[PDB]
Each structure stands twice: as C-alpha cells, then as structure tokens.
Design a protein around this ligand. Structure first.
Ligand SMILES: Nc1nc2c(ncn2[C@@H]2O[C@H](COP(=O)(O)OP(=O)(O)OP(=O)(O)O)[C@@H](O)[C@H]2O)c(=O)[nH]1
Ligand SMILES: [Mg+2]
Lengths: 857, 169
C-alpha cells in the first residue's frame, strides 16, 4: 500500500464531510492494522513526517499507531506490547523510532505533541525490557539550554508522558528530574518551554517519589516551583500553583519546612493580589491543604495508631487566611445572572473546607465579619456576609451553630427584603444551609414562622431566588419531619399554596418551575393524615396540569418548545407518582382520571421519555386498587407486555412485580390473563439480554401465578420445571461476595416456584407426579447447604414441601422418597435447638408425621 | 458560524441519549454502545443568528473506542459527561480531561453530571470538585427529565462567540 493512499484514509477518517467515507476509511485503517501490523506501523510513521499530508492526518497517524501500542485495558496492553516486540522487524523499529524523534522536533508543535505521545507509548513497551537505551540520552540532551525552544518543549513534554505511564528510566530519574526542573527555572527560557516543564513535572510527580524523598533533590525542585509562583506571566504562575497543589496532595508529609520558611508567606501575599486569576490559584492551594487535612482526620479516626499526623496548616493560618478569604467573597460578578465561576465562588468553597477542617475555630473571624457586613452600604458586603454564614453551617459543633443561628437569624431572614437580587438569592440558600444542617436550632414557636415567611416572599420573587427557596423548603421538611413533634405540618397549607404558585409559572426560567415540583414531591413524600386536604390539593393541581400539557401534542411546536413541555410533564409525573405511593385515597376517587391520563400519555408518539415513569405509577396505583384494577387490565395489557419484554431494563422487573400483585389480588380470575403473561414470562429468563436481577424475579413469579392459577399452569409446568432445575444446578460465577448471595437469591426463587406450584396443584397430583423427584432433589441441596437450611424461612418452606407433597400422594405413589436417611435426618435437624423458630419446628412436626404415614402405607 | 464539539465520557453515561434528544426530541431507552463516533450537527437559533455545533459523539467503551483521541483533532470545545448514579464514571473524569487537553491545547470544556433525575445519587454535589480544580463549568444534567437541557450548549456558545449576552429561547 502506498504511503499517499494510506495518508488519504487518515485524512478521510476525520476530514471527509461524507459520513460514509469516514466510516469506510476508519474501517480500512483498522483491518490493515490487524492483517499486516508491520506495514501499518511503518506507514503510520511515514505519514507523520510527510510534508504533503494535512496537519490532521499527520497528527492522526501518530495517535492511532499509539492506540495500537498502548491501551486502557491491561490485557490489550500486553497483547500490544508483545505484537510490537515480535511482529515489527528490527529494521522497522529503528525506522519508526527515527521518524518519531524527527517528528518530535518538528517546528509544528501539534505534530511534536503527537510524536511525544507515540514516543512515550513505544518507551512503555521497550524500556522495561532494556530496549531503546539511546532514548534517555536523546531526551535529556534535547533539554539542553542551547537547544532551540521547540526541541526543548516537546522533549520535556515527552519526558512527562513517559514517566506518567511508566512501569534505565529509574537509574535515569535524577537526570529526568533535573532536566524537567531545569526547564522551569531561569526566568529567561521561553514561556512555552517553562510551561511544558511545569506540566511535565506534574505528570511525573508520582514516578519521582524516591527523588521527592531526598532533602537535596526535593529542595531544589521546591525552590523552582516556588519561584514560578512569582512569575509575571499568568499561565506560568497557574502551572506552578498547579504543581504545588499536587505536591501538597502527594507529599503533605514533607511540607512543614517549606510552609514555615516560604510558602506560608508567599500564599498570603498572592491571596491579596488584585488579579482574580492569581488569588484564585492560591485559594485552591489552601483548599487542597484543607482537603488533605480533612482526609487525615478520617484516616486517624479509623487507624488511630497511624504514623501520619496533621501539621494543622489551616488551623495555624486562620488569623491570616480566613479574613483574606472573606475579603474575596466580595468579588462577585456585577451581572446578577452571569453564573461564571470566579474567585469569590472559589473562596466560598475554601471557607466551607476551612469550617469542616477547623470546626469551632472558624467562628470568631467569620462572626466578626458577618455582623460587620450583614447591614453594610454595599450589596457585595451584605451578600458576602450571608454567604460566609452558610459556609460555616457544616464543621462547627451543634451547640455553637445553634447558638449563633439563634442569634443571627432575624438579620438573615430580614435580607429577603433587599433590593439586590444576589443578596436575596444567597440569603435563601443560607436559610437552607441552616435547615439542612441544624434544623433543631429553629424553635417552632419563635423562628419557624419567620423562615416560612421568608420562603413565601422568595417564591414570588425573581426565579433565581424562588429556586433556592424551593430547595430550602425541601431541606426544612427533611431535617424537621424526622423530629417526633414535627412543627412543619402547621405550615403545610401556606407552603403547598406558595409552591403551587411557583409551579404555575409561565415558564421554567432558572429552574424555578422544576424546583417547585421537586418541592411538591417532597411535601407529598413527608405528608401525614393530619395534612390530607392539602396533600389532596396537590394531586388535584397536578392532574389538572398534566391533562393541560396533553392538550397540544409535541409535533405542533419547535423542538425547543416540545422539550420544555416534556420537562414539565416529567416534573408533574414525579409528584403524581409520589401521591400514589402515599395516599391513593385522593386519586382512587378519580382512578379513571389518572388511568385516563396515563393511557393517553402512553398512546401518543414520542412517549419513550415518560413510559417507564407512567408504568411505575400505574403499578403502584394497581397495588392499591387490588381487584379494583381489573377493569383496566385489558387496555393496560399491551403496555405490560411492552415492559416485560425490555429484559435489559429495570422496568421489566417491576413488570414482573406487577404480575405478582394482580395474580395475588385477583386469584382464579387471573386465569383470564394468565396465558399471554406466561408466554412472555417463559421466554424472558432465556433471553441473552436479561439482566441478572430478572431471573430470580421471574423464577419467583412462576410461584405466584401457579398458586393463583392452579390447573391452568399445567401447559407451562414442564417448561418452568426445566428453568428451575438448570437454575438449581448453577454454581456461583466466581467466589466473591455477590457471586454466592445472588446464587442464593436464585435458589430462594426456585424454592418460591415449587412452593407456589405445590400450592396451585393441590387438587391435581397427577400433573405434579412427574416432578416429585426433581423437587426432593432440590430439598437435598437445602439440607446440604447452610446458606439455605440455616435460614429459618427457607427451612420451614423446604420441610413444608416435604409434608404438603406427602399429603397429595396418600396411595404410596411416592413413599420411596420418605424412607431416605437424609430426609429423616433433615426433619430432625429442623426440630432442634433455637436457630429455628417455633413456627418452623411445628411445620417440621407436620412433615415428620406425614413422613411416618408414607412408610406405613 | 459552526464549531466542532467532541463529547466524551464512560460508556452508558448518556452521551448519545443527550445528543439524540437535542437532535430529534426522541428519548432513547435502550443502551446501544456507540461504535467509534456518531457525528451530528446541532443548530441553536440564538438572538445573534444561528450557531451550529458539529457534535462528535464518541464511544465510551474501550472495545469500541474507534480512533479514540483521534476524534479530538481540531475540536474547538468539549463536553465531558459522567453518570451521577455511578462513582466510577466520575472517578474517570480526570482521565477524560487529560486525554482531551493533550490533543486540544486550550479549549472551553463543560463537565456534566447526567442522570440527576434518578432518586439516589451516588455522586453528590459535595464530591463534585473537578470543575473547581481546572476552572471548568459544571452542570447537573438529565437527558430524561430535561433538567438544564440547553445549559452546556448555551455556556459553550457564549464562550466560543465571546458574547456573555447570547440567548437561545
Ligand atoms: N434515568 C435516566 N436514564 C438516562 C439518562 N440519560 C441517559 N439515560 C439512559 O442511560 C443509558 C445510556 O445511554 P447512552 O447514551 O447510549 O450512553 P452512552 O454514553 O452514549 O454510551 P457509549 O456510547 O458506550 O459511550 C440509556 O439506556 C438511556 O436511556 C438520564 O438522564 N436519566
Ligand atoms: Mg453513545
């Protein structure tokens, strides 16, 4: 194959506007890789350095050869390693390598970058076997100061990648570290080279551990990275802080001296910087510090002997750092609806970490700030204050938080009347941070009313504000209703009323509508009898609303308009599902409404988005109505089969569940729908796409059906006996946790099936007769395996089968089973000790007596 | 005015679902692994005329990687998606970011935590800290409930066009 023809495939793979060309070209490249890897590799290396090929094709040449050399999968990596070693001729190896090194020094940086990636990939394969010994010297020599900017840059880059994926390299580590750090020191190297070095150091941090664990090398390295923080170039600073963060994460242990001697002072200074990017960089450093100190606290709690110890950098710095962080909270975006992440948001995150890490020690500086800005001229100050307060609602102990919440709440609640949108937005959030973390700090008689009033104001305000109030109401209802004398219900009508107002918003701008529906869902989740009239107002509202959305089907408006509508119908269904899973009392009277609406929903096109939700909702409604659901079963049947057949989806499992319930609520009348269900159920389990969870669900539902359906199950009896005989002889997939607990789940579901079958066929012994041996064989496994027999319920079932089966064959047709030793011995084990409850022992008595009659026939 | 957008993330996180919805309004229920990449143009009719994202919907499964980071060539922006229901899909976010920026030097990237409609999140807002470390934009998203449906594209369009006041409606 020509190098030019190969180059055209590569260009076509990503540059062709024709999708069929792209697919074809990628396919042709792939088979060339499989059939003649030697040639593929070689040609790839040539297009890389081919001046006639477009950038994209040359870059792609390097990357895809690399993707045939190294891999995320650990078996593929060994396969690829071996292929390169055995299939590529020594002549081609040198040819490829030489091309890569040339490409690495290209004046076009994106080519050198890709060449850097390919070089690293080849080094992963060859360096562990002491091959490509020339490489280190090349790589280090390209880092020489006299070398041109590009040659140094891509080489440092290549060194980075090389170390990062690494498995000479080790004995060359000093030379690497020096070469990397060299390229970053000296103010007067190129920005790009200095950048490339700092990033190469980052990628290499784990692989230079032994270097980092030497005062000499570590100090040098740390000198350079610290200097780089004080670069005039912003990106170089960002790279430097980037390394500092990683170093703090990786090598916290060694950081105290550098903190004490330099970093402590450098990072206080830069935290003040009037440039937001700079202050951001350094805030992150301190967040990292807090994160690693917080994780240390967890680690000591679970390993109190650990030789690791916190240096308390945060704690020691609160006097300097926290005030400077609080100062950065007043650098918000003027534009109330910017939402772009900035240094103030970074500062807030860092303060929360400071709270969580220093606990109570955070209180003094923050409360001094809050009290002093909570009613200041500037909105920025007012907002920073309520921000600050909410940021410390997690970390300090319950006593402190309660005390200061109690003290500051009147001022906070009062800020809902502010002219500033940002202040109100953050104020509403602050309320929810109080609720979510210290609900019992809000006395029901003297605080909770002021809170509710603040939320109801905010639901009528700008949508950004109303969104937060909804989430805050959710928090309130969650952390309050868990207290036995819950005072929230006293306010349910006021809250449900204001929430509906928000749910009736013209649109869902800034999620104010979707928020409100989520709140309504929660209000319903935590409803009690006391609040039925208001819980009923919810279902009445959303049913009306759902019907309303259905008036105009989607294929009338723009895509955009349809998706906004479908979001609203999804929002409504969340509430409607929760109402049915709590108080069907308020929708049983309009059962036809819901079903009417649900059937309409499932009728129309483009329903796939709600189908499962509606199915889940119907199921739960059906559970309530019991026999009351039969009048729908007809028209619901298509959708039930639709759901059962989706064996890869969880919806099939609740479909199995739905059958369990209607088979049990109806009984002998299920016979009318029995066959169509079973024709599907008998297939499901042997479908190559069936989930794991499906099998035991189905195995057990055969039990349900058989017991309710009786003689009508017989046509399917043999087919089901095959399925749970194969199942009972199935060993664990491996030896792990789930392996056996699933296998037991299967075995318990086989037991459900036989129990249900024996129950169902009480009147029809002739039909069961051929399977007595099969069942007694399963009972042998129960008697054998402790995971089965030691479970009280499983044994009582097993030993109950022994008895019930005997009661069906009073002519000695099966008496040969009752004379076996294991059976006499199994009945005996079940009447012994405590393990087995009284109910089990009394069933074992029944089985013992039935078994004695068999022998005396 | 058009831009190449590469969409990446662990398999089954909802990348194709997200895109197909934006494309046609259809919510795909079945999970069918993407084979290499599906390229589809998305147009948004903004207040400053139409903007077009040529979306490269890449495969998440190693088996079906295709050209893999070969698809990032010339990408002008990206979406990293993870599944909020699956801790491992967030654990791999840093890898997706790395493999991106090694090919696309300096581009705007949005991080999306999909499936927020599902009841019990396994990756709460507390754990989501990567946007913060690498100055990216993060959104909770749900390709099913259409939560923040248009946000990732709105943010990218603004940064790409360089106009903070760009609107979709
Ligand atoms: N509940 C819920 N399910 C979702 C959501 N988004 C996607 N899904 C489902 O998740 C599954 C994954 O869909 P895909 O889009 O094919 O996943 P993918 O990321 O494209 O996978 P790959 O092509 O292998 O990378 C599908 O079954 C979707 O129906 C969501 O927001 N909520
Ligand atoms: Mg896909």
């Amino acid at each position: 194959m020509s190098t030019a023809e190969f180059a055209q495939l590569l260009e076509n793979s990503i540059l062709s506007p024709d999708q069929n060309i792209r697919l074809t070209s990628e396919t042709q490249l792939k088979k060339l890789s499989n059939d003649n890897f030697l040639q593929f590799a070689g040609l790839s290396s040539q297009v890389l350095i081919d001046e006639n090929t477009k950038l994209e094709g040359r870059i792609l040449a390097a990357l895809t050869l690399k993707n045939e050399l190294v891999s995320k999968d650990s078996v593929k990596t060994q396969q690829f390693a071996q292929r390169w070693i055995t299939q590529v001729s020594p002549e081609a190896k040198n040819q490829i390598k030489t091309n890569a090194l040339t490409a690495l020094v290209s004046i076009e940086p994106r080519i050198a970058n890709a060449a850097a990636q390919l070089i690293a990939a080849i080094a992963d394969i060859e360096l562990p076997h002491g091959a490509w010994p020339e490489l280190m010297k090349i790589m280090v020599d390209n880092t020489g100061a006299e070398q041109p900017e590009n040659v140094k840059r891509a080489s440092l880059l290549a060194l980075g990648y090389m170390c990062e994926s690494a498995d000479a390299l080790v004995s060359s580590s000093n030379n690497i570290l020096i070469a990397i750090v060299q390229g970053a020191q000296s103010t007067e190297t190129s920005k790009a080279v200095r950048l490339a070095a700092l990033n190469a150091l980052a990628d290499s941090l784990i692989f230079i551990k032994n270097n980092m664990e030497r005062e000499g090398e570590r100090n040098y390295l740390m000198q350079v990275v610290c200097e780089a923080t004080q670069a005039e170039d912003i990106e170089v600073q960002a790279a430097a802080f980037g390394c500092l963060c990683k170093i703090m994460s990786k090598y916290y242990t060694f950081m105290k001296p550098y903190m004490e001697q330099a970093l402590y002072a450098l990072t206080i200074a830069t935290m003040k910087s009037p440039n937001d990017k700079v202050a951001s960089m350094t805030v992150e450093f301190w967040s990292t510090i807090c994160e690693e100190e917080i994780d240390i606290a967890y680690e000591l709690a679970q390993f109190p002997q650990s030789p690791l110890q916190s240096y308390n950098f945060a704690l020691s710095s609160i006097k300097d750092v926290v005030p400077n962080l609080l100062n950065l909270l007043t650098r918000q975006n003027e534009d109330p609806e910017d939402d772009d992440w900035n240094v103030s948001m970074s500062a807030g995150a860092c303060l929360q970490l400071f709270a969580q890490n220093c606990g109570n020690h955070i209180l003094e500086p923050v409360l001094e700030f809050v009290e002093q800005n909570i009613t200041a001229d500037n909105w920025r100050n007012r907002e920073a204050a309520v921000m600050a307060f909410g940021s410390i609602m997690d970390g300090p102990d319950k006593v402190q938080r309660t005390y200061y919440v109690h003290q500051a709440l009147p001022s906070i609640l009062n800020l809902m009347n502010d002219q500033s949108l940002q202040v109100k937005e953050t104020t509403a959030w602050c309320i929810g941070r109080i609720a979510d973390s210290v609900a019992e700090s809000i006395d029901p008689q003297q605080h909770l009313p002021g809170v509710v009033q603040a939320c109801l104001i905010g639901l009528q305000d700008h949508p950004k504000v109303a969104t937060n109030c909804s989430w805050t109401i959710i928090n309130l209802v969650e952390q309050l209703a868990e207290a036995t004398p819950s005072p929230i219900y006293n306010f349910y009508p006021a809250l449900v009323d204001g929430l509906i107002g928000a749910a009736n918003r013209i649109d869902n701008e800034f999620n104010a509508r979707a928020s409100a529906f989520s709140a309504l869902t929660t209000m319903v989740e935590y409803a009690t009898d006391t609040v039925a009239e208001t819980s009923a107002s919810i279902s009445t509202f959303v049913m009306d609303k759902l019907g309303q959305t259905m008036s105009v089907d989607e294929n009338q408006l723009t895509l955009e308009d349809a998706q906004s509508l479908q979001e609203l119908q999804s929002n409504i269904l969340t509430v409607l599902a929760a109402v049915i899973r709590k108080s069907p009392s308020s929708v049983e009277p309009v059962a036809d409404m819901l079903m009417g609406l649900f059937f309409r929903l499932l009728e129309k096109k483009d329903s796939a988005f709600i189908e499962d939700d509606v199915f889940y909702a119907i199921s739960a409604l059906a559970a309530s109505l019991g026999k009351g659901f039969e009048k729908y079963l007809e028209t619901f049947s298509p959708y039930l089969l639709k759901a059962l057949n989706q064996v890869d989806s969880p919806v099939s499992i609740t479909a199995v569940g739905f059958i369990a319930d209607i088979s049990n609520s109806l009984e002998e009348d299920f016979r009318r729908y029995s066959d169509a269900m079973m024709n599907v159920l008998a297939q499901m389990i042997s479908n190559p796409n069936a989930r794991r969870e499906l099998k035991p669900a189905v195995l057990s539902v055969f039990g349900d059906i058989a017991s309710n359906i009786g003689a009508d199950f017989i046509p399917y009896l043999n087919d089901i006996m095959a399925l749970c005989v194969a199942a009972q002889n199935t060993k664990p997939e491996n030896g792990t946790l789930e392996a056996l607990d699933y296998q037991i789940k299967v075995l318990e579901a086989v037991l459900d099936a036989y129990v249900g079958i024996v129950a169902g066929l009480h009147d029809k012994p002739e039909a069961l007769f051929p399977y007595v041996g099969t069942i007694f064989q399963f009972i042998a496994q129960v008697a054998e395996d402790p995971q089965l027999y030691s479970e009280d319920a499983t044994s009582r079932a097993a030993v109950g089968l022994i008895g019930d089966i005997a009661a069906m064959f009073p002519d000695g047709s099966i008496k040969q089973f009752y004379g076996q030793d294991w059976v006499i011995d199994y009945i005996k084990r079940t009447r012994s000790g405590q393990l087995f409850s009284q109910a089990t022992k009394d069933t074992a008595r029944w089985a013992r007596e039935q078994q004695k009659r068999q022998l005396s026939l | 005015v058009q831009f190449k957008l590469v969409l990446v993330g662990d398999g089954g996180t909802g990348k194709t679902t997200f895109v197909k919805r934006h494309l046609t309004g259809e919510f795909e229920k079945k999970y069918v692994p993407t084979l290499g990449v599906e390229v589809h143009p998305l147009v948004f009719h903004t207040n400053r005329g139409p903007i077009k994202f040529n979306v490269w919907d890449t495969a998440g499964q190693e088996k079906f990687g295709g050209l893999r980071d070969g698809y990032y060539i010339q990408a002008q922006c990206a979406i990293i998606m993870f599944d909020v229901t699956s801790r491992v899909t967030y654990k791999n976010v840093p890898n997706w970011h790395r493999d991106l920026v090694r090919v696309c030097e300096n581009i705007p990237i949005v991080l999306c935590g999909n499936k927020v409609d599902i009841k019990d999140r396994k990756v709460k807002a507390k754990s989501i800290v990567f946007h913060r470390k690498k100055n990216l934009q993060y959104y909770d998203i749900s390709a099913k409930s259409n939560y923040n449906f248009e946000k990732p594209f709105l943010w990218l369009a603004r940064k790409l066009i360089g106009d903070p006041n760009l609107e979709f409606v």
